[PDB]
Structure 1
Amino acid sequence: GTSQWLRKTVDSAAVILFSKTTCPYCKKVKDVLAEAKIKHATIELDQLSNGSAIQKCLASFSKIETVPQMFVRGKFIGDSQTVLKYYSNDELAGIVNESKYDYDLIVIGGGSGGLAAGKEAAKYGAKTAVLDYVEPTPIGTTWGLGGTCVNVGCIPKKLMHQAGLLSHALEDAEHFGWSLDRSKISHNWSTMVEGVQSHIGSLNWGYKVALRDNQVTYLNAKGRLISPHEVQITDKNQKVSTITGNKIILATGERPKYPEIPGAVEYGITSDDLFSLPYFPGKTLVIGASYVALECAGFLASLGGDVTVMVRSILLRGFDQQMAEKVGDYMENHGVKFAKLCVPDEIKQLKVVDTENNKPGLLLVKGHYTDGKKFEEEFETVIFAVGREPQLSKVLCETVGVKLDKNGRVVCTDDEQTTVSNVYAIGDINAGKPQLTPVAIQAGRYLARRLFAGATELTDYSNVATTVFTPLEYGACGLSEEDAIEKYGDKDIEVYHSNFKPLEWTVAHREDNVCYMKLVCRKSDNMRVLGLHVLGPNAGEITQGYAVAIKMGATKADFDRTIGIHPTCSETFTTLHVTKKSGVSPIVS
């Protein structure tokens, strides 16, 4: 293992120093490198149990077993005397910059994964380029650096969710003694969008500054991988050039799908357009039943919108269906209409968007229900939320030899390596991985450390917690109840559950027995918690800490022995006792 590790580490590191913490010669090299502004990885052999074995293996590359040893791009450069020789002769700059390639790393895609990977790689002296380009939506929407989450995903969706939550805060404030005339209070969509877009603008700028401050080259250019080490770039002026890189990270993400019906591309919008929409959507139809569809429907209804969701089959396919039903029931009871078992056939235009006075157009949506009844209703805005897909050319990928699956996603090893050994894929294009921002960031930063700092830690994609930011939020970590029963059998599954009522909801006259949580446990494995599920306010804050306990193998007894914090929603997890097998109601007084 030690020999294989050392060979890979030496081959891939841009600039790396083998050192010991107590080694004055090591300190002298560190001081020279720091004076010369040369960034590098450092491995302290006296902080590794196999450090003595590593020292002996180093002689296979350098012919010495002493520290310090400095390497550049797979070549031993010297001990302390040799490094100080290069410095004193003004040779050291030329040596640490010598490469077959323009860059140690080229990241194609400046989103959650690619910016994380690029910034982290640059810290170890990898000469890094990040390419980002935002192909416009069909109506011409575009945005700045930072990817889906920053511009058209997690950040603006959660801000618009917060504007929706503040609706309920205005209602609650009267019950808690605040004197306000709600009959005279309205929401202004464009004022909210201006706020959200000013924050996004601060992130676009922040990322450009962060790349500049890490000596990363940012190119606003479309990248195409044309051979293992060569990236063709096309700038805004349609000027084409080629740059070369040692390691390549594909981090190009996905874009919204459209249904293949007349009028969809011409008259509908997607989440890409919604978060900067210059006009209030008005009476809205959301087609789809993903977390995006329900999140978007939810905040638009809480901002005073007339909202309908058109659902082909079920809500939140792949999530726990009991929890998905409760999420949708809350929405239907709080102002969202559902056209269930219904699909669209055509969108017709009745009015064009007013691009001068910022008002929506008008659309006729024709569809049909499974019962044979026609759907025909006017909406001001139609939002498709029917899935996202990667944008890689299947032909070009095959030419370079990067394997894709039938969905067009990249087939990777558990260390993000593609079938082209210097090329890696992270984030939403990595086939089979949870499509989440913190996953892409951990994958990118951990990969950068393996490539350029001799790290071994892999990303753990198991039991990744999530939250759906519907009007009543849904947090989960681990298996759905149905998936646990399919895997282990009904006889080996115990489910503990309870309704609960936030204290905040009492004086506000909100519902009893609507917030709900459950633990899905394995009887034969000491009642191991396989799945945790919570429907309630602040569900992401609730869920996150339990994700650490589940990663560690938490059992029901671990939950029971922990004392609650009172008064909280989360403390209910520490006192669950009603099982589903008992048939006793989970409702509470």
Structure 2
Amino acid sequence: GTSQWLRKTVDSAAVILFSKTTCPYCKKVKDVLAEAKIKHATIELDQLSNGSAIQKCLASFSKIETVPQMFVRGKFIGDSQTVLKYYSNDELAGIVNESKYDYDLIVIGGGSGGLAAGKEAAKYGAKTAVLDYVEPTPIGTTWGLGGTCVNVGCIPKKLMHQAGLLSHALEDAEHFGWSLDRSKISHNWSTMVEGVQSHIGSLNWGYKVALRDNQVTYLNAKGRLISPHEVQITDKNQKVSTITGNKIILATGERPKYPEIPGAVEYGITSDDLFSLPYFPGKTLVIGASYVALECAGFLASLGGDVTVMVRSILLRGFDQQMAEKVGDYMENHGVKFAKLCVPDIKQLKVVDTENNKPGLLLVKGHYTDGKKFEEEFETVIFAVGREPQLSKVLCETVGVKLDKNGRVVCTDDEQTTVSNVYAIGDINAGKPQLTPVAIQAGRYLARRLFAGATELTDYSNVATTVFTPLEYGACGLSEEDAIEKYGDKDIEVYHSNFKPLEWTVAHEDNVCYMKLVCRKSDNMRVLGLHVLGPNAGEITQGYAVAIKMGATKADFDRTIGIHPTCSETFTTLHVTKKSGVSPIV
């Protein structure tokens, strides 16, 4: 296997140096490279078990077995004498810049995954370009560099969640002795939006600075892969040109879907528009039941909105359904209305007032499964009915990249597509969890395999999640119903408990927060899934994901001592099983 790895590493690395830590001839080459500002990867053979064997395999390319050995784009360049010869004759810069292609790496898409891959690749001498373009929404909304999470996703959504949580902080403060009266305080949407957008703007600018500081070429242009190594770009002035690259990373993400009903595209909005909206939505209808739908409905209600969610069937399809129902019950008891078993069939009553920054007015007609008609007026209608890629705008079908039935890219476990120099990461990689830290880990780990000879793969199993509804829901691993389907009801034991945050006592609910561990009896009570509904649920859940990755059992949870007073410590003392029928209430 050693020989196969070395051949792949030499073929793909842009600039790479084989070395030993204790060799003065290697030091001399490093100093020349440092002075000339030549970035490169380095592999220290004296820190590898099979380093002696690698030293022999190197002779298949260089006909020598000593260190140092320097390679550029698959070609042996020289030992120490030869490298210093090139440097002394002012020939070295031209050798390390020689390529059949314009770039070692072209990244199509400047989001979570693409920016992480491009920055990491450039560290090892890969000449890199990042392409990013934001097709405007139907009403014209657009934004800067950084992708979905930065501009219209995790970042603004959690900041508006925090604004909503602060409504209940204001209420709590009265009970803890502060002299304010919450019922006399109001919220100003546009003041919130301006502060959120100023933070987003600092991130757009920080990414541009980071790319320039890493010598990455940033092009604000739409990319299209027309052959394995050729990318056609269209710029802001609609000028069309072509650039070539050795490795290609597709990282173009997804966009919101709309239902195929009259008025939907003309008069409704999506999450893409919500986070920069210049007016407060007012009385709002959210159509959908995804985590995006419930997160947005939740903070709009906490900011004083009259909010309704229209649910076709169930909440949070794909998540543990006991936990999903508890999430929804909390919202319904705290100001969110639900139109259940209902679908839409949108009429305009008032145009948006762009001068006084006020919403319009819409009539929504729909129907319930029991035959009743739905007809109600709303100032704003938000569609959260899923997201999809549009790779036909990105990828000419004659290139040979395989897609699945949902339009996502079919990859091997190292992110390789059916075209061997082309890779796909992030939301468009079929079958993978669609999360920002997954995209970042995939992109950074792939850059190291391509340009630094690394072997580590990304591990996509048991990736922890948190839904940032008014009461947050964190999870790691299998739902209870999925565990029972996979292993049988007789092999599953479930420990559970309600709890109450100490913070909620003086603030005046008892038995609403909830947690459970889903375990496998025949495998030493291995923890298969962890679930918690409560405040700060993402901070609670994160550390347990390390223990689950290492194969934690119920016994491991039992022997660990709790930190007091915290919500998380309740996981360390669980004892009530579902099989026993004993109530989980306090």
TM range (shorter): over 0.9
Confirm or deny: 8 A CA contact 2:286 2:382 kept in the other structure: yes
User: Do the aligned residues in 2 keep the contact of 1:394 with 1:404 (CA within 8 Å)?
Assistant: no
**Conserved 8 A contact 2:516-2:530:** yes
State whether residues 223 and 394 of structure 2, in contact with CA within 8 Å, keep that contact through their aligned partners in structure 1.
Answer: no
Task: Report how far residue 448 of structure 1 moved.
Answer: 0.2
Separation in 1, partners of 2:305, 2:535: 22
Range 176-185 or range 367-376, more displaced: 176-185
In the alignment, is the contact (CA less than 8 A) between 1:390 and 1:429 conserved in 2? yes
Question: What whole-Å deviation, never above 9, does each CA across 1:175-211 have from its counterpart, x for those lacking one?
Answer: 0000002232100000000000000000000000000
Cα distance, 1:395 vs structure 2 = 9.6
Deviations 1:524-577 (A, max 9, x none): 000000000000000000000000000000000000000000000000000000
Deviation for aligned residue 1:437: 0.1
Q: Displacement, 1:154?
A: 0.1
TM-superposed deviation, 1:20: 0.6
Identity rate, percent: 100
**Post-superposition offset of 1:396:** 4.4
CA distance in 1, matches of 2:152, 2:194: 14
Deviations 1:98-153 (A, max 9, x none): 00000000000000000000000000000000000000000000000000000000
- The answer to whether the 8 A contact 2:308-2:336 is kept is yes
Whole-angstrom CA distance in 2 between matches of 1:418 and 1:10: 21
Superposed CA offset, 1:491-529 (max 9, x none): 0000000000000000000x0110000000000000000
Deviations 1:161-184 (A, max 9, x none): 000000000000000000002232
Whole-angstrom CA distance in 1 between matches of 2:380 and 2:52: 67
Structure 1 alignment gaps of length 5 or more: none
Structure 2-normalised TM-score? 1.00
Q: Do the aligned residues in 1 keep the contact of 2:403 with 2:410 (CA within 8 Å)?
A: yes
Aligned partner of 2:524 in structure 1 is: 526
Q: Is the 1:224–1:231 Cα contact (8 Å) retained in structure 2?
A: yes
Distance 1:253 1:192, change over 3 A: same
1:391 Cα deviation (Å)? 1.3
Preserved CA contact (<8 Å) 1:164 1:302:
yes
SS across alignment from 2:58: helix
Contact 1:285 1:310 in 2 (8 A): yes
- Given that 1:394 and 1:408 are in contact with CA atoms closer than 8 Å, whether structure 2 keeps it comes out as no
CA distance in 2, matches of 1:209, 1:313: 46
TM-fit CA distance, 1:394:
7.8
Distance 1:12 1:439 in 2: 24
* Within-5 A mapping of 1:172-571: 172-345=172-345, 347-393=346-392, 396-509=395-508, 511-571=509-569
- Verify the 8 A CA contact 2:109 2:253 in the aligned structure 1: yes
**Post-superposition offset of 1:388:** 0.2
Supply the RMSD in Å over aligned alpha carbons.
0.7
Distance in 2, matches of 1:273 and 1:536, equals 29
User: C-alpha distance in 2, partners of 1:378/1:348?
Assistant: 9
**Any conservation in 1 of the 2:270–2:382 contact (CA below 8 Å)?**
yes
Structure 1 position 332, deviation (Å): 0.3
Change (3 A) 1:394 1:195: closer
Distance 1:370 1:53 in 2: 70
Runs of 4+ more than 3 Å apart: 394-397
Is contact 2:527-2:553 (8 Å) kept?
A: yes
Quick one: distance in 1 between partners of 2:157 and 2:182?
Answer: 25
Tell me if structure 1 keeps the 8 A contact 2:70–2:78: yes
Task: Decide whether the 8 Å contact of 1:499 with 1:586 is kept in 2.
Answer: yes
**Compared with structure 1, are the counterparts of its residues 549 and 397 closer, same or farther at alpha carbon in structure 2 (3 Å cutoff)?**
farther
SS of residue in 2 equivalent to 1:186: coil
**Offset from partner CA, 1:235-266 (integer Å, 9 cap, x none):** 01000000000000000000000000000000
- Per-residue deviation, 1:398: 2.5
Unaligned segments of structure 2, at least 5 residues: none
What per-residue deviation string (whole Å, max 9, x for no partner) do you get for residues 441-496 of structure 1?
Answer: 00000000000000000000000000000000000000000000000000000000
Listed one character per residue, the Cα deviations across residues 390-436 of structure 1 (whole Å, up to 9, x for unaligned) are: 01008944210000001000000000000000000000000000000
Any idea what the Cα deviations from partners look like across 1:58-80, whole Å, max 9, x if unmatched?
00011011110000000010001
Partner Cα distance (1:340, 1:229) in 2: 51
Matches of 2:111 and 2:395, distance apart in 1: 22
| Equivalent-residue separation in structure 2 for 1:225 and 1:512 (angstroms) | 57
Contact kept, 8 Å, 2:298 with 2:470, in 1: the verdict is: yes
Q: Which range is displaced more, 516-525 or 392-401? A: 392-401
Equivalent pair of 2:224/2:393 in contact (CA under 8 Å): no
Q: Indicate conservation of the 8 Å contact 2:106/2:247, yes or no.
A: yes
User: Counterpart of 1:122?
Assistant: 122
Is the 1:410–1:429 contact (alpha carbons within 8 Å) kept by the matching residues of 2? yes
Asked if the contact 1:21–1:44 (Cα under 8 Å) also holds between the matched residues in 2, the reply is yes
- Distance (Å, rounded) in 1 between the aligned partners of 2:294 and 2:197: 22
TM score, norm. by length of structure 1 = 0.99
